[PDB]
Nucleic acid binder design. Structure first.
Lengths: 59, 134, 260
RNA sequence: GAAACUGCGAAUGGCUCAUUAAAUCAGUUAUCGUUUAUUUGAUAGUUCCUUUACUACAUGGUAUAACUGUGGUAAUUCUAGA
RNA sequence: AUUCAUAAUAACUUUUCGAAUCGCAUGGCCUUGUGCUGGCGAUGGUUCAUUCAAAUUUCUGCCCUAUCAACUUUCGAUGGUAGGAUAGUGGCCUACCAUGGUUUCAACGGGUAACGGGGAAUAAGGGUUCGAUUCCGGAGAGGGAGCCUGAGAAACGGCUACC
């Protein structure tokens, strides 16, 4: 699953591939603008506050 | 032997285009016709011009030969003649060279391909590069 | 047709332009302006077909956009600007002035004039009304609006415009016994004097006009323009002085010139 | 001087004659029954956030293309986020 | 010929407009300021007028057919009043009311291998036949309908839906 992630106070952006769909469910059933918790998102995302901003489906 | 004997008729001075315009009738018995370059150099000494401010075109030969009727322009200077002459006539006289250009269909197809691109196209060039790379 | 038309086909242009049939499909369509398009002469038609100063449209445009030509004191770089009846066009180079008036055959003749009379023009009063703030104004035939007119000025009167400052100089009343000029119909180009005007309530007042050679005709009020008094006009007239010589009369004179 | 915003144009032109028989159209009228970009000529000294905001007129601020960079889809003059 | 143009009084208003725009040359003056005053453009803008138009509109004039004689009107047909809608008049639409309107001087219906006209062919005269087609007017953009933008489109080298 691709993750186009941006840090905008310094204008940086990068893509992740976060597999193991049994833990991606923090994003599931969540709309644009809602807040997820990065603790379950990954081990390196300790204390990050990710806001949903968009995305592209298959096709 | 030749007896080109150029005659000039219907001369108006037109300083609006800063030129003189006239019909030119050539009597060339025992000859096919007279070249436009020869007309230009003849009218050059007729009007004390520089031979590049003189332009001629038209020049229909009458039936049976011996006489031809055409059009002539004598401008006041070379650059001023350059500003008002058509590009094809300037190329005809060598004062200008024809520009390099593809055919009209080629230009139209290029423009239609240009319509299908928004922006410069460098963004999409690198995006399609990184996609078709795998 | 979903909006206004922008092209004028050849054979649908007014016949007095004398455009030749075979040179193309289109005539210069006059733009919107001071005169109705049926009663206008495009500057391109005047400068190319009348004066032969230009050979084609591109040279017409090159003349116009360099401001060598000015109409009513203004440049008008537009190729098809609708010049019209009695308008004075100044071409400062060559020091030439023209008044655009029809010859007696119903087509605009090239009328050479001096500078002093190139300085002014005449306007036929088309309307008299009270504007905003109760200010009267007159409307001329060329769409000019002149505020504060003389109260004696009425409809179908004539005014003289200074043409450098569009201000009223003097007027002429529409009355019996005064030289007029027919500006439409088959009497276009005729010059004569009012005999009498017939009323005909409900439309199209008629006027009876007598020529210099005592030739009498009648015409609609809409097409009658006052230019001055008998034998003293405010406009120089072109060759012929609006007489309408008959066919055999033109024949014997034209042989007098050429065929002897 | 590419790209893009703004403005204008894209309702012209060209093609065709399917429909259509008081319809279209023609000549002749009317608008004292209306809309009218454009051209042209005129035309606007009167404005205290649309009053305790006399807290700039020597001149207000916000928000976006193009662009930079990270991307999706086989594919469209598709476009997402920063 | 106007309850016209105007002009006045009283108020009203998701308060419209009444220049925060640009190029070139940049002079003249007094008050030792980078002060005052400066041209010619350009674009824009409210009403009026003009112009290019559009919309509606008066009268008169269309081929064949009765093996089409009655048609229209409950579902607007004809007219009235009021309102709504429109740029505006108007059954354009709505409510109420009246029973009207067309027709053997051919209504209505049917057919057209009918777009209309300027015109074309032939023709002593009178006529007959043709006119999809170089100009003018109309209509359409596979068939219908709807609509955004815009001064102007029910647009199709615009969009939306159905077939």
């Amino acid at each position: 699953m691709k993750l186009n992630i941006s840090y905008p106070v310094n204008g940086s952006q990068k893509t992740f591939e976060i597999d193991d769909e049994h833990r991606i469910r923090v994003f599931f059933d969540k709309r644009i603008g809602q807040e997820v918790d990065g603790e379950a998102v990954g081990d390196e995302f300790k204390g990050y506050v990710f806001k949903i901003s968009g995305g592209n489906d298959k096709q | 032997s030749d007896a080109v004997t150029i005659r000039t008729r219907k001369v108006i001075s037109n300083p609006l285009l800063a030129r003189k315009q006239f019909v030119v009738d050539v009597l060339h018995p025992n000859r096919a016709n007279v070249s436009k370059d020869e007309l230009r150099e003849k009218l050059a000494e007729v009007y004390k011009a520089e031979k590049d401010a003189v332009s001629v075109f038209g020049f229909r030969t009458q039936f049976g030969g011996g006489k031809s009727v055409g059009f002539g322009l004598v401008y006041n200077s070379v650059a001023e003649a350059k500003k008002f002459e058509p590009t094809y006539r300037l190329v005809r006289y060598g004062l200008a060279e024809k520009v390099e250009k593809a055919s009209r269909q080629q230009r139209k197809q290029k423009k239609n391909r240009d319509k299908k691109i928004f922006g410069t196209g460098k963004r999409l060039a690198k995006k399609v590069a990184r996609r078709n790379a795998d | 047709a979903r909006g206004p038309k922008k092209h004028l086909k050849r054979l649908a242009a007014p016949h007095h332009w004398l455009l030749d049939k075979l040179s193309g499909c289109y005539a210069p369509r006059p733009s919107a302006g001071p005169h109705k398009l049926r009663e206008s002469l495009p500057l391109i038609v005047f400068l190319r077909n009348r004066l032969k100063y230009a050979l084609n449209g591109r040279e017409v445009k090159a003349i116009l956009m360099q401001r060598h030509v000015k109409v009513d004191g203004k440049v008008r770089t537009d190729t098809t600007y609708p010049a019209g009846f009695m308008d004075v066009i100044t071409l400062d180079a060559t020091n030439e002035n023209f008044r655009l008036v029809y010859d007696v055959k119903g087509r605009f003749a090239v009328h050479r004039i001096t500078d002093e009379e190139a300085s002014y023009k005449l306007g036929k009063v088309k309307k008299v009304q009270l504007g905003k703030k109760g200010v009267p104004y007159v409307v001329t035939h060329d769409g000019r609006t002149i505020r504060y007119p003389d109260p004696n000025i009425k409809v179908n009167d004539t005014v003289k415009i200074d043409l450098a400052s569009g201000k009223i100089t003097d007027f002429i009343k529409f009355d019996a016994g005064k030289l007029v000029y027919v500006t439409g119909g088959r009497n276009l180009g005729r010059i004569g004097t009012i005999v009498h005007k017939e009323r005909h309530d409900g439309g199209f007042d008629l006027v009876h006009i007598k020529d210099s050679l005592d030739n009498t005709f009648v015409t609609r009020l809409n097409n009658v323009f006052v230019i001055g008094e008998q034998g003293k006009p405010y406009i120089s007239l072109p060759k012929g002085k609006g007489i309408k010589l008959s066919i055999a009369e033109e024949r014997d004179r034209r042989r007098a010139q050429q065929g002897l």
